[PDB]
Write a protein that binds this ligand. Structure first.
Ligand SMILES: *[C@@H]1O[C@H](CO)[C@@H](O[C@@H]2O[C@H](CO)[C@@H](O[C@@H]3O[C@H](CO[C@H]4O[C@H](CO)[C@@H](O)[C@H](O)[C@@H]4O)[C@@H](O)[C@H](O[C@H]4O[C@H](CO)[C@@H](O)[C@H](O)[C@@H]4O)[C@@H]3O)[C@H](O)[C@H]2NC(C)=O)[C@H](O)[C@H]1NC(C)=O
Ligand SMILES: *[C@@H]1O[C@H](CO)[C@@H](O[C@@H]2O[C@H](CO)[C@@H](O[C@@H]3O[C@H](CO[C@H]4O[C@H](CO)[C@@H](O)[C@H](O)[C@@H]4O)[C@@H](O)[C@H](O[C@H]4O[C@H](CO)[C@@H](O)[C@H](O)[C@@H]4O)[C@@H]3O)[C@H](O)[C@H]2NC(C)=O)[C@H](O)[C@H]1NC(C)=O
Ligand SMILES: *[C@@H]1O[C@H](CO)[C@@H](O[C@@H]2O[C@H](CO)[C@@H](O[C@@H]3O[C@H](CO[C@H]4O[C@H](CO)[C@@H](O)[C@H](O)[C@@H]4O)[C@@H](O)[C@H](O[C@H]4O[C@H](CO)[C@@H](O)[C@H](O)[C@@H]4O)[C@@H]3O)[C@H](O)[C@H]2NC(C)=O)[C@H](O)[C@H]1NC(C)=O
Ligand SMILES: *[C@@H]1O[C@H](CO)[C@@H](O[C@@H]2O[C@H](CO)[C@@H](O[C@@H]3O[C@H](CO)[C@@H](O)[C@H](O)[C@@H]3O)[C@H](O)[C@H]2NC(C)=O)[C@H](O)[C@H]1NC(C)=O
Ligand SMILES: *[C@@H]1O[C@H](CO)[C@@H](O[C@@H]2O[C@H](CO)[C@@H](O[C@@H]3O[C@H](CO)[C@@H](O)[C@H](O)[C@@H]3O)[C@H](O)[C@H]2NC(C)=O)[C@H](O)[C@H]1NC(C)=O
Ligand SMILES: *[C@@H]1O[C@H](CO)[C@@H](O[C@@H]2O[C@H](CO)[C@@H](O[C@@H]3O[C@H](CO)[C@@H](O)[C@H](O)[C@@H]3O)[C@H](O)[C@H]2NC(C)=O)[C@H](O)[C@H]1NC(C)=O
Ligand SMILES: *[C@@H]1O[C@H](CO)[C@@H](O[C@@H]2O[C@H](CO)[C@@H](O)[C@H](O)[C@H]2NC(C)=O)[C@H](O)[C@H]1NC(C)=O
Ligand SMILES: *[C@@H]1O[C@H](CO)[C@@H](O[C@@H]2O[C@H](CO)[C@@H](O)[C@H](O)[C@H]2NC(C)=O)[C@H](O)[C@H]1NC(C)=O
Ligand SMILES: *[C@@H]1O[C@H](CO)[C@@H](O[C@@H]2O[C@H](CO)[C@@H](O)[C@H](O)[C@H]2NC(C)=O)[C@H](O)[C@H]1NC(C)=O
Ligand SMILES: *[C@@H]1O[C@H](CO)[C@@H](O[C@@H]2O[C@H](CO)[C@@H](O)[C@H](O)[C@H]2NC(C)=O)[C@H](O)[C@H]1NC(C)=O
Ligand SMILES: *[C@@H]1O[C@H](CO)[C@@H](O[C@@H]2O[C@H](CO)[C@@H](O)[C@H](O)[C@H]2NC(C)=O)[C@H](O)[C@H]1NC(C)=O
Ligand SMILES: *[C@@H]1O[C@H](CO)[C@@H](O[C@@H]2O[C@H](CO)[C@@H](O)[C@H](O)[C@H]2NC(C)=O)[C@H](O)[C@H]1NC(C)=O
Ligand SMILES: *[C@@H]1O[C@H](CO)[C@@H](O[C@@H]2O[C@H](CO)[C@@H](O)[C@H](O)[C@H]2NC(C)=O)[C@H](O)[C@H]1NC(C)=O
Ligand SMILES: *[C@@H]1O[C@H](CO)[C@@H](O[C@@H]2O[C@H](CO)[C@@H](O)[C@H](O)[C@H]2NC(C)=O)[C@H](O)[C@H]1NC(C)=O
Ligand SMILES: *[C@@H]1O[C@H](CO)[C@@H](O[C@@H]2O[C@H](CO)[C@@H](O)[C@H](O)[C@H]2NC(C)=O)[C@H](O)[C@H]1NC(C)=O
Ligand SMILES: *[C@@H]1O[C@H](CO)[C@@H](O[C@@H]2O[C@H](CO)[C@@H](O)[C@H](O)[C@H]2NC(C)=O)[C@H](O)[C@H]1NC(C)=O
Ligand SMILES: *[C@@H]1O[C@H](CO)[C@@H](O[C@@H]2O[C@H](CO)[C@@H](O)[C@H](O)[C@H]2NC(C)=O)[C@H](O)[C@H]1NC(C)=O
Ligand SMILES: *[C@@H]1O[C@H](CO)[C@@H](O[C@@H]2O[C@H](CO)[C@@H](O)[C@H](O)[C@H]2NC(C)=O)[C@H](O)[C@H]1NC(C)=O
Lengths: 164, 174, 164, 174, 164, 174
């Protein structure tokens, strides 16, 4: 019950921890699961494209399972629900970046770091595009490394405080 | 590729098609065709042409619901597009039978400020695709004279893009 | 002056610390005060029903004390102020949960943990309802315990860093 | 009840009645009656009936402010309710004298898409109470033919609920 | 690349770290630069007037440099972009405070602490006004000191964890 | 001044004039004059007077764009102000030639609820300045009979204030 970003309050207790995306939810991929700590970051972050997409999937799951009603789109339901589920500022910033020919997120692919042998995952970040294609890791090599360092720092700080 | 010795860079790609049951998805084929899809059965094509389908100089939109309408979802989507456009009545509409369609007259005299642009801008906003000469978007124009909105069937319409709820949702946010 | 969630900047300096709710503000209860640390969490949290209610009371107090004007409702004032004071997303999520028959907050009662002999309080969370009644602590026992552990962790981390 | 040995679970309940001086509070009595209250003196009842109060086929709403209106707060609340409803003129209004009242005709031919539902949905939204068969809320209907909005006095109207600012505020947010 | 509050993703790599405001951006002042750590706070803070102003300047810079188009105001661009760049709640709270004759931020001057010999800076906070003039540091002496203590605490906590 | 021994209190002041190329700035001179400026060339004065400029009892606003309009930016700003005001047609407009101007008739019979107040309130909101008797802002009135909006040139208009984008942006947020 460490996830507040979700609509219902059940989701966390079912999977042992973390949050899983099944095969059907992914393109050309098998089941992937992210650590509880990283997923829980969406509870407070109010600036991440991944978290909003994650929330839409959670919503969709609930709508399908909860509404016994014929599965017609309830347009009224979406029009009502979107204000609660989506951060419109992210939508507009990516729209704005596209307008100004600045690399931006088009909500496709997400890139994350995975610490070898431990399977420790960062929360995924959006893989930016410009001029009809994706940007190379070379352009944003620096950001990739910043995330690696952020993960290292958390690991060490935890060890020190656990040791205390 | 290991960063700082131990962190592998790994990728994830989302399948947004699974969201088709609750929200419309926008997917494009090329600069002339954008497609909005509902569920696994229907949708509307948005297309740019130099020909017409409607010979009317008027839009019978309110009559489309006065008559029992053909699909609340589609009428809602069409209305949303129209409501977004700032107005001016440069629109003709048919809505006769199950085949529902609307046509906009993208006419102008300098084009800056016309509703024809309001239509073009909304059209592009509805389906970003990859949006590919970095000028201002504010007063733009295209070569096509007309915009057609028409019902269609569940086939193809996904090239240079994949279905995404973002277009529709973005307009709701506006 | 550790509270930024308030409208005026005076509120904290008056009571020794923390924030108090008088008898008149509570149902069938006497004065209750919460610790400064917990109250201050509302400065950054943007997802808590309790904090928005707390803010409305603070607003109300200021409107009554500040406006010398006949106490008519200024509808225009509320219509103007609400956008700043209330997180509409919380309102809509609880509305949505009700629609989908998912337990939700109806802004009534709030449940908190109190560490014995020290009086250390968590910030209160909303007590959910469904099908005309309140949910038992059994259904959300897990969340209650998560909060207890969160409080324990903070206590220990503080002791260790204070010791350093 | 001590969690982890030392944490007592303790409860708090808010008195929202103290907010009556600055914002309207919504409180219900049953499925036929919802009450909106102002200050410590007045308010409006919202009720579902199968009888009528207004014999008009028209609403003299603008005339209600043309004439010096009877209370800006109440006119504002009434207007807000009406503005929320998507439109269609299935409303009749009196507003003659201090007793102000409005009546909606909840008429329909399949009911999905009617303004009668827009009214029913807004009505319920305005006063959640405890909202108690998990179907879609989008196209719903009730047994009552009419909705009456009328001034009233400061008595009772709180059963299965307590006064709360949430209903009103939620509509402002929309 | 530690700044996410910006529109483009380049801004951080250019200046060695931190964020600089040139002479042209300041009134009666020469170049000033703030530390990276403090600036980065705007990535998560959703309640600070300084951060929104900072963002407008960043936007302006990009619009001028990126748009090759004649520099006419694109009103449509601003009307579109503002929703993403400005926290309207701050605008409304200051508006509300002014209405109620409560000291408020009018987005003019900002006050910060600077640790001597190290040049360590807090993120600036808005200097409030009321009744046609600025408030004295005496009225908000307490807040100034709270910030000084917050900086001290961070310094010490870092030293202890670095030592671990 | 060192706090806790080591922290100097230092100040920063922002120059918002550098933002003139992308967004309008509001700057005042006194209670009778508020000025909105664009780029480094033009702007609109907002002024409170007891005289008139327009002898019309009507506003030719739509004709202002029907005719090739004189500046999209200014027409947009004027429209925005007008749209903000809740309505009532107590407005006359000229827009003839490059000199564009509008005049509002701030007429009332008790003033509470008139559009004249809607205009006064928006006017003040547009340019806070320093806003300097703590009564409610809701139903206020001034001594001036008319509001004039008129094009002007790039001179002065900054006393007791400095240019700021906040006024305009605040109205967009509303
Ligand atoms: C975010 O931004 C990125 C970057 O622009 C977009 O990425 C593009 O995604 C599209 C769709 O996945 C790629 O387009 C093409 O997809 C074809 C698959 O569909 C075909 O077959 C079905 C039937 O099964 C038909 O219905 C359909 O009409 C098509 O005929 C591929 O076959 C295409 O292959 C061609 O290009 C590749 C190069 O990538 C060559 O190797 C092939 O030989 C062939 O010539 C093609 O892949 C498009 O390529 C992607 N671009 C890039 C740079 O990767 C994202 O779509 C966008 N948004 C989201 C939400 O993801
Ligand atoms: C959030 O959701 C919860 C759960 O549904 C709601 O909780 C309900 O709250 C109401 C109001 O407090 C409870 O309703 C009844 O209140 C009566 C008190 O008012 C009476 O007297 C006044 C005069 O003083 C009259 O004006 C008024 O009309 C009433 O006649 C009690 O007397 C009722 O008692 C009956 O039920 C209890 C069981 O609880 C029996 O023991 C009694 O003998 C008697 O039969 C009753 O309490 C309602 O019971 C609460 N429900 C639950 C499950 O607790 C919240 O109101 C809602 N929102 C907010 C903001 O709180
Ligand atoms: C936030 O709130 C604060 C507090 O109210 C406002 O601060 C005021 O700012 C204004 C403008 O900076 C100060 O007003 C006066 O500015 C004059 C400068 O402009 C003159 O010269 C130009 C040509 O160069 C002309 O175009 C223009 O019309 C003016 O003639 C000064 O000359 C004035 O000086 C007078 O007052 C001072 C006292 O401060 C005396 O010492 C002088 O001798 C003289 O009598 C004056 O400074 C105003 O004083 C400031 N008030 C306070 C309390 O500091 C902010 O503007 C507001 N918003 C923002 C965004 O900053
Ligand atoms: C629209 O989205 C739905 C998902 O929301 C897509 O349908 C899903 O298709 C997969 C693969 O066929 C089904 O997976 C398997 O289904 C069986 C039977 O239910 C189950 O026993 C397996 O364990 C597994 O889950 C999935 O259930 C099904 N979901 C639903 C709700 O039907 C649908 O194909 C999408 N439509 C379009 C046009 O893309
Ligand atoms: C609407 O809300 C107001 C509160 O905002 C309620 O009035 C309050 O009632 C309490 C109890 O009677 C008063 O408490 C005591 O008042 C005396 C005299 O002021 C004071 O000396 C005591 O120390 C104590 O505060 C409280 O002051 C009063 N507040 C106000 C502003 O009048 C009112 O009853 C509510 N109305 C309804 C219909 O519920
Ligand atoms: C409206 O804002 C622009 C800034 O966005 C103001 O123009 C700026 O004026 C300064 C001082 O004259 C220029 O600084 C210097 O310019 C030269 C030549 O470009 C350069 O070599 C120096 O290193 C330095 O940057 C600045 O470039 C110029 N910026 C632009 C975009 O023109 C303008 O004065 C403001 N208008 C009003 C009415 O206040
Ligand atoms: C991070 O790397 C580990 C190690 O490969 C991944 O764990 C494996 O995931 C695959 C997924 O198909 C399983 O088949 C393996 O059994 C897992 N264990 C190992 C040690 O291989 C982990 O999934 C990666 N993280 C993510 C989110 O993909
Ligand atoms: C987008 O694709 C469509 C479909 O292939 C192209 O339109 C077709 O053009 C041929 C040749 O003129 C006609 O026979 C088909 O009937 C047309 N199909 C449709 C659906 O109109 C269209 O020209 C392409 N546009 C761009 C910009 O590439
Ligand atoms: C869109 O849907 C309509 C029906 O909802 C289709 O119209 C049918 O068209 C066929 C072929 O001409 C007729 O035999 C049917 O009688 C029509 N039905 C009705 C009630 O309109 C239309 O063809 C579809 N359009 C596309 C492009 O798929
Ligand atoms: C639609 O028709 C118009 C009018 O013929 C086309 O616009 C002209 O195209 C010729 C080339 O064939 C150019 O030399 C002219 O300069 C164009 N006119 C203008 C005002 O630019 C237009 O290209 C046609 N559109 C499509 C999609 O075929
Ligand atoms: C947590 O528990 C302590 C201990 O009971 C509470 O402190 C008491 O509160 C009551 C309230 O009526 C006072 O009468 C007592 O004098 C307080 N002291 C003790 C030791 O009993 C504290 O209030 C509780 N926390 C909350 C928020 O209720
Ligand atoms: C809600 O309560 C009201 C008030 O008790 C009920 O309406 C009353 O019904 C009696 C008997 O027909 C009449 O004599 C009263 O005049 C009615 N009062 C009012 C205010 O209309 C109403 O039926 C109840 N509704 C539900 C769903 O329980
Ligand atoms: C609502 O308020 C109005 C007055 O604002 C009340 O109307 C009065 O009703 C009594 C009884 O019939 C008359 O004697 C008065 O002359 C009326 N005054 C005016 C000016 O209308 C009305 O009764 C109230 N309604 C309720 C249900 O309380
Ligand atoms: C209002 O009047 C209508 C019409 O008489 C009532 O609706 C019918 O009620 C009978 C039972 O008396 C049912 O058998 C019918 O099937 C109902 N009609 C429909 C279309 O469902 C309605 O119940 C009355 N409403 C109230 C609140 O008394
Ligand atoms: C905090 O204080 C230090 C020490 O004065 C400032 O660093 C100096 O800034 C001035 C700015 O003109 C430079 O000329 C000096 O060379 C800098 N070094 C020293 C040691 O004087 C620092 O800028 C201050 N912080 C801020 C944000 O103003
Ligand atoms: C605000 O300043 C203006 C400009 O000085 C004042 O209006 C001037 O008044 C003189 C004397 O009547 C006239 O000759 C000028 O033509 C007026 N100028 C303008 C632009 O109207 C105005 O009275 C001042 N208002 C306040 C409240 O101080
Ligand atoms: C505002 O701008 C207009 C032009 O855009 C100015 O109008 C001109 O005024 C002069 C002096 O009377 C005439 O010679 C020009 O022919 C006018 N041009 C047009 C096309 O209107 C007007 O004076 C400006 N107003 C202010 C106060 O600066
Ligand atoms: C505009 O004209 C009106 C009408 O003459 C002025 O209002 C009156 O001013 C006299 C003083 O000259 C007061 O004794 C009256 O009480 C005022 N009337 C009202 C209804 O209050 C008004 O002051 C003039 N406005 C300006 C800016 O000069």
């Amino acid at each position: 019950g460490t996830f507040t970003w979700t609509l219902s309050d059940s989701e966390g207790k079912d999977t042992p921890g973390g949050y899983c995306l099944t095969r059907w939810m992914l393109i050309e991929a098998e089941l992937k699961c992210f650590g509880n700590t990283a997923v829980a970051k969406c509870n407070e972050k109010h600036d991440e494209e991944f978290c909003d997409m994650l929330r839409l999937f959670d919503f969709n799951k609930q709508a399908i399972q909860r509404l016994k009603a014929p599965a017609q789109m309830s347009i009224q339901l979406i029009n009502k629900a979107v204000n609660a589920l989506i951060n419109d500022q992210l939508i507009m910033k990516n729209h704005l970046r596209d307008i100004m020919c600045i690399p931006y997120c088009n909500y496709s692919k997400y890139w994350y770091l995975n610490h070898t042998t431990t399977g420790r995952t960062s929360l995924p970040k959006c893989w930016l595009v410009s001029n009809g294609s994706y940007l190379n890791e070379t352009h944003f090599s620096d950001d990739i490394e910043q995330q690696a360092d952020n993960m290292i720092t958390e690991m060490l700080q935890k060890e020190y405080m656990e040791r205390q």
